[PDB]
A paper describes a structure:
S-layer proteins (SLPs) are self-assembling, crystalline proteins coating the cell surfaces of many prokaryotes. We determined the atomic resolution structures of all functional domains (I-III from N- to C-termini) present in the three S-layer proteins SlpA_ac, SlpX_ac, and SlpA_amy. The Lactobacillus S-layers are anchored to the cell wall through interaction with teichoic acids (TA), either lipoteichoic acid (LTA) or wall teichoic acid (WTA).
The full-length SlpX_ac shows differences in structure and domain arrangement compared to the SlpA architecture. SlpX_ac_I accommodates a similar fold to both SlpA_II, with SlpX_ac_I being slightly larger. Likewise, SlpX_ac_I is structurally conserved (RMSD: 2.6 Å) to SlpA_ac_II, indicating the possible dimer formation as observed for SlpA_ac_I. Therefore, the SlpX homodimer might be incorporated within the assembled SlpA layer via the two described interfaces.
Residue numbers in the entry: 56 to 182
The structure:
Amino acid sequence: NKPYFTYNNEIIGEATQSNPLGNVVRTTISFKSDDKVSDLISTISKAVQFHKNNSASGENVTINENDFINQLKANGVTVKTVQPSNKNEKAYEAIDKVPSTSFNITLSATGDNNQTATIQIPMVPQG
């Protein structure tokens, strides 16, 4: 009766003893220099739904942006704050430099009865 994610409405499996990569989504999110962090999070969030138990309707995953950027940074992405050119513009965070190697982003959520589900989403740099 476990909580679970879907990605574009496909049920994502658990990591199992036999298949420890059972929760790696069959997708790739591409990213490149100048991509807005908000746009990458939006792409992931549109695709991912969490289910707090086996029969529950899907709910939006809310991805913490600080956690997300720290995952990017640990995996060789450098991040820039693009500064506003005057007081009427807003700063935003964007991909600065990309690594050569793919990596997974980890997303977890806690459902009913403090049961946690985790999925891994592959990130593909374009150079």
